[PDB]
Design a protein around this ligand. Sequence first.
Ligand SMILES: Nc1ncnc2c1ncn2[C@@H]1O[C@H](COP(=O)(O)OP(=O)(O)OP(=O)(O)O)[C@@H](O)[C@H]1O
Ligand SMILES: Nc1ncnc2c1ncn2[C@@H]1O[C@H](COP(=O)(O)OP(=O)(O)O)[C@@H](O)[C@H]1O
Ligand SMILES: [Mg+2]
Lengths: 253, 371, 1339
Amino acid sequence: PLDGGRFATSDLNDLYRRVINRNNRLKRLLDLAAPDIIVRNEKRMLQEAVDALLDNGRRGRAITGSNKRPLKSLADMIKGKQGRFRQNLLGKRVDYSGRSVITVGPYLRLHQCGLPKKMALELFKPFIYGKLELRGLATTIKAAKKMVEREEAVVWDILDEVIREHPVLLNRAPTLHRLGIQAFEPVLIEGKAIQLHPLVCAAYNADFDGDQMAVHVPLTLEAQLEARALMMSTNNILSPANGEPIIVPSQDV
Amino acid sequence: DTIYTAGTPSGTSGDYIDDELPVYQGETTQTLQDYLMWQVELTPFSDTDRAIATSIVDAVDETGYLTVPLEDILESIGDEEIDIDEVEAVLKRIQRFDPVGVAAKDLRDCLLIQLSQFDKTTPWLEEARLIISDHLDLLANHDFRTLMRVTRLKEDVLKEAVNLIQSLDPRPGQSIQTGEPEYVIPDVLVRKHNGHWTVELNSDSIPRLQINQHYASNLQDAKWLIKSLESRNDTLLRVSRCIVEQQQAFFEQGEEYMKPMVLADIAQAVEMHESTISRVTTQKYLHSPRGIFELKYFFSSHVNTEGGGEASSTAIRALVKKLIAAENPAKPLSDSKLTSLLSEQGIMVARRTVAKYRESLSIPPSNQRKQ
Amino acid sequence: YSYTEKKRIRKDFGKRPQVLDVPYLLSIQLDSFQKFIEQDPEGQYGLEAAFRSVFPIQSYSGNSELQYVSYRLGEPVFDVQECQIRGVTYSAPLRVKLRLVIYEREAPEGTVKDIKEQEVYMGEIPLMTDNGTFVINGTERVIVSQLHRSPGVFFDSDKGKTHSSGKVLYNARIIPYRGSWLDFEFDPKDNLFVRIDRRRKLPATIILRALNYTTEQILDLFFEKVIFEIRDNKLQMELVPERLRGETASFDIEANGKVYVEKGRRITARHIRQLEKDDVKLIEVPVEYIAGKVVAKDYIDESTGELICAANMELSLDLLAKLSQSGHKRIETLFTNDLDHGPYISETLRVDPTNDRLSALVEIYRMMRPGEPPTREAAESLFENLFFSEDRYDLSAVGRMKFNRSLLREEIEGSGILSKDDIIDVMKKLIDIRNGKGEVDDIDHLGNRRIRSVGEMAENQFRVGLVRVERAVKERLSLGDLDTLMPQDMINAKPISAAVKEFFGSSQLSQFMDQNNPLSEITHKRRISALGPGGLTRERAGFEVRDVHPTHYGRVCPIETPEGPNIGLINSLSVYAQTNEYGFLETPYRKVTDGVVTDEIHYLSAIEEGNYVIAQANSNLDEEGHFVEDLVTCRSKGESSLFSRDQVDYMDVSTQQVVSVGASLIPFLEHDDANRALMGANMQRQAVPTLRADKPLVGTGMERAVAVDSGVTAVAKRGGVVQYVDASRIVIKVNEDEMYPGEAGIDIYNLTKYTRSNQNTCINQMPCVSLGEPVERGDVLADGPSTDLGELALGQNMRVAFMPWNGYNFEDSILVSERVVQEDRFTTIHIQELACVSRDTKLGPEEITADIPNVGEAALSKLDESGIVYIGAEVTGGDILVGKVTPKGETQLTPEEKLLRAIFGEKASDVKDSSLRVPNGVSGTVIDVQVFTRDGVEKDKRALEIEEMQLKQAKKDLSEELQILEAGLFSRIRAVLVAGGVEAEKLDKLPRDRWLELGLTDEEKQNQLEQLAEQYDELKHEFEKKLEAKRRKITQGDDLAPGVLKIVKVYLAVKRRIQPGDKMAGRHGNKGVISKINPIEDMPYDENGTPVDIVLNPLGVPSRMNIGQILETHLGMAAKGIGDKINAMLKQQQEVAKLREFIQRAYDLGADVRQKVDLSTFSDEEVMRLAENLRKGMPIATPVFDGAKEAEIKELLKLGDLPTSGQIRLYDGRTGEQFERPVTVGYMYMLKLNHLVDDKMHARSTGSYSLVTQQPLGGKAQFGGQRFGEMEVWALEAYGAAYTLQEMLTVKSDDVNGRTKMYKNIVDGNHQMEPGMPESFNVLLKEIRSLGINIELED
Ligand SMILES: Nc1ncnc2c1ncn2[C@@H]1O[C@H](COP(=O)(O)OP(=O)(O)OP(=O)(O)O)[C@@H](O)[C@H]1O
Ligand SMILES: Nc1ncnc2c1ncn2[C@@H]1O[C@H](COP(=O)(O)OP(=O)(O)O)[C@@H](O)[C@H]1O
Ligand SMILES: [Mg+2]
């Protein structure tokens, strides 16, 4: 859809229109009983149109629509790095996720991370709705939504209550080994940057010169127990490739 | 051929990284029904209550009013144990969602629903409630006198109650409206120079395609499309130019100067089938210094002229508007008096035609315009 | 020193003399565009060449023609500032004069029947501003230069990688400036092959045949003849000794009765020398020797008339007997030796099937035009148009020059079309290369790569448009009434304008200018990109092109290059680099004649530079110029070594002619790792300007050049005295001698105040001159962004200590004091623009008003009567800026609608709200509103107020000029009256109007009075006319896009502070993130109780190898120390003598510096102002490769009474206990990079999803989610968390019902999921099924 209420046909629609036009012309010529010398080239062109629709560019010249750019076909939709398999099925974007820069907190304990509260309000919102409804502060969903929108003085106490023991997953790209995703317990801080324990950076290959991190929230009870029992930062002292410790002091320590 | 001396920039980079942009997919949006259903899901209903709620929210228009009566909904449920009181309870529950007052049968119901959610400390609440509940047409018709008799209230309290009434929301469902409205690009432009109206197609809308003929059949077929486009735009330009020539007086002196021309005139002037004229002028607009007008706007009916000729219905409508616009508030003009007044300038239109024109222009009759 | 440099003189530690001054940094753009525009009588550069290339145009009948005469560019309608404010291109109209001539018939040649001349319009050409930038649609743009392969002929080869035998294949490619390429290639079987436009391979001899050549001619061309004689006995031969080199005898070499070489014995050089000495010609060779010799020319017997044999054929015994018996005593053969003189052409002819002229041409036509039957005439026409038609194939002047140079010719001039001789010589040189003689070319050589600038590209695009215009013109010119038509009717302006604006606005090489600071602009303008049309690609580049070449020395910066996929493909010009008249980079060198280094400067290119010996700038010299040592380090032929004194030819001009500007702005560069130098140079240009600029305490002396040559500071056009200085304008009264006649001499400089840059930063100029003080031509009057008294200033000087502090500077973190925040040192201003457009609709014109129906009075408080917010209003998210109502619709209505209209008004039922609101999460103060209304529409109060504000300034300027002129005239009238013997006191007391209310005597006095009255009234009328013209310009209506009524633009300004998470850096590649804002009483403090500002980690210095920063710190401290001393001499009123003595002692310090400062030439006021400027620290300059030694730093530390080691004793702020070891404290220049944590932070719980795959969108601007790629899935699989993965895959991304059920259960305090099927899998199933393949689930 362009501006002005008009539309432009995409690649698949273009190829469909082309094959339809060729088929209609060939059918009309067949009804007319035209000389065969013409129906031969018409059938050849219809064959080429169908081949271009199914897999464009495999045989002969690739058909382009504009700016000398080849038109995507069904095969190109299926295959490649941009196809369904490697872009929407083996990896996908998710909800309840955030990202920001990371700083150093030298006071944290090994199972703790520092989370800005403006991020925690957004990530944990439905839990806040449920907790607000539970104690009668909002009899309806719209009242709780309005109260959270206004950022009243009690939603902060509610937020402190709902994240007491609820791990979050921290991730930094590229994830080269299984220690690139680790679960921590949140501590609400004032600011806009995540605070990271100094002893885990060597596992993340992370330094504080502009690195960013992503944070995800488990939802079900099984996910929370997996985060606490499998992915917690206190369960990853030894390396799965060596058996040697990776939670090791370096530099100033 | 002029250059726009001011404009707005586009927020983007001039050049993009050479990789191809991903195919267009789209993006979901939240209309009124989506919000209402979201609130429905998070509400402690039973299963039958949820089915009735889905059926009800299905039948809510853009403004937030319930378009179908409850009998239709109860029939659409398809069960026989369910009565109408359950439907009433579900509707009352739904009407208190956000925005308050949605899915209301009529204006009185919407106003009462909005009023029921106030606090008793409000200065004049019961007066407003009574006025809405019983005497509504009095407030709409600007009586202000028999309302004082029935309400047994002095001036100040009634005025404050009306102030409270005009503080509510009559269209509660339009708070969640569409993002940004569409706009139409004109096809042809009519400027004026040398005391004449020049007609020219929109340059910004007509590019010339690059001729792909180098790999050379297909070349001949491609040129066929070029010739077809040439003939199409030539026909459009000829029709528009002829129409502009016929309606020169309107472009200069505005309304009240159109001519009663039909498709036959254009067909005989351009020597073409009238079906083609009907086809080409459909859903196409022309931009004039006076505004933007559909290319089919200049065709209308006519009325007999005493001295000779015909008068455009558009001219009659404009004359009626200008006559009404300068009437005395004490005694507004009536239909018969309007017909008598117009029957001095050669205008011969029946009272029924005057009534039809007045209804088309959406002007209340004389008794509702008296001050 | 200039006046602006006498205020604060930067101490210089450099030691080598300067012989060439740093040139203008923007010559590459300005000279190129000036070449494009300016008239050229020779007609080789610019629009003249393009016009002459296509014209004259003659119709097919040849009965008429168009003749271009000349052209002209008009005056721009607007100015740069006006174009930027409005948002239109700053361009000029192109007016070209043509002449149409009509021919007749039945007459010899062409008679002149009618000639019609007309001046026509061809389009708008954008113009270049004074800073080498273009204003296209309101935004400044830069067209960067291209580095492309030059036209000509190049010889290359593959390194055996194409054949498994590892045999190298050689090829020669001819690439023109415009036309079709040509390729000659060798195959593994040694057969020459030809190729056109990368099409099918063809035999090489086809080209020879197509040029009317015979086989005998070819064999004569490519071979050396050998003549066999039959002197009635056994074919006696005329032998030459040199031909026998490398040959092994197969017969007996005997002559004059002496056997020189015996049968079977290899021929040696001694035998050849003996044969040369003896002069042996007659050699008897057996018939057996003719086993394989190939005849040259066809032979026929006289009596028979038939052919003995055909050419290019080996001779046999029977054929030898047949020719001998046929009276043949002379035969011709070819010399085909193995080691040299190889037989490649003969075998090429053998494989070649064609043996004529036409069949080869038909084959060429079939190859280039397959799918159709051939034609003789069509094939001939195609071949002629291929390489010899001026309309299709052109070899440019540089192409011809390179072509001739590659073939060792003498002349330079030539034709752009090819000839037989050129192709023959190309094949000859290729064959010679195959035979071990000669060598291939190096493509990365900067003698093979050319610089293409904006003018050349614009000229090419203009020609491309002009050829289409010619194609259109040739049609109308064929037939028509030759009288009533005009040249205007034939041309069509649309293609030219379309092509030109497309090139200037949507090309690959046209980009938005970087506007973080002046350095960004300077660096962006001086850029060389190998990409773009006609260039390389990020995928077909290779690996050798991405590396430093020895020819880059002095032309292209080796350091500055972008890391990432574009490494090595983007370059920045060096300080002194220029271009040839052909486009090859060149660098300057001093000429050394007879061992004495002169001051004569020569510019050498890459090719010429290799044939000399070039010394180094580091070499020491005597006062008269001789070298001081017998051995000198010099470069020669790509190597570097030692040479004698007399061997040297040239010498470098500066130690900094190798680095670029950004790299030359780094102090102590030679002590830094190259990677750290590159990182520092890249980060130095991303620093946002701050509230108050601060000079660098340690610099390199390149600050002033970058500041002045950037265009961000107002520089005086002429000298004079500051008549009127204000925070928004400057008015200079020009000196008498520089004034033009008949002119009130004043310059008016309007400063720009708080305008928006391309990166939403602030551009603001501040005056830096006082009232009534002298200024000379070239001085700086105003400071732009990041500038202090004309010196570039990107950051702030901070007191820094190197020590670990409780882990708050662990792993490159930075600990910052709170006093830094309390003083707004790193506080920036950011400016944003939002626009609202009211246009026309089919239901009515969209209106701007404050009478919005369904909005309460509270939200309408800040709007005025017109519906636009007041100036200075503070707004936040959701506030209404401009109120706009859109007509909702029109219907037949209904009783409920009538009731609604009756109760709640008519306007509330006719329109709906569409106002402009501040986006969520945005704040600022409204500092500017601009309104543009279409012509003919009635204006509103806001627009009228703005127009009055605009008119006031023009009236003020005109009044200033007029009043100065009137005072000048009144001086003369008063002087004339006084010379007339008038009552002087009476006229002194009379007002200046009463002076005109008088009369003079009947002598010439009355004539003078009349003359001056005439002049007075004429001047008044003229300036009234000027005022009326400017009022017409200001009050002019606006022509907008059709259907658009009004446009309103609003500007917001906000201030940003420093906080944890922001990124800071130095100039030595030491970046970091602020981690904590420590309170003031916690920072470490020295003996005097002065705290430190920033604490860094020492461990980061040795592991990064950027030692220079440490050095800077030490030197920085020294500088600060000096300031303290001076400051102490000012708090107590010390007299000027001691102040100037100490300042002179400080300036004289050093070991043979090149700067001589003499303060005895300074008046006491100048000395006091210099001390006032120096009281905060004496700035110091250290050139890149001629910096300050450690001994000089130690001496400077001693002068300021500071410890020489550079380390002091600090104390703990929390416990008062001394740290156990001395700590390094100093002053370092810190920047604030444009990576603010306000932009990075983002979170999302639920939003909008894609329409097809039903997955969340991506990006902060779309309010999207974080991607969970394949590798995170692998990590979760490795952990074994199946439930986390399952809820990542279905209920958070794609399970359409799963999302809703999960949300509902979460609200209810029940944490449990009911997963389903992702929608992307169903999409995949549908897409696979659409291929005609049945895939399904089962059971
Ligand atoms: N093309 C890339 N693909 C994947 N990861 C990359 C790529 N380029 C950089 N990285 C990541 O960036 C990291 C580099 O970190 P950073 O830029 O902070 O500097 P550093 O290597 O720690 O050194 P220093 O801070 O001392 O200059 C790498 O360890 C790697 O994880
Ligand atoms: N291509 C990349 N992929 C993943 N991480 C990267 C990449 N480039 C840089 N990073 C990481 O992100 C951090 C911030 O990078 P950024 O500041 O954008 O790069 P630069 O410092 O070169 O401008 C760096 O510390 C680096 O470790
Ligand atoms: Mg990093």
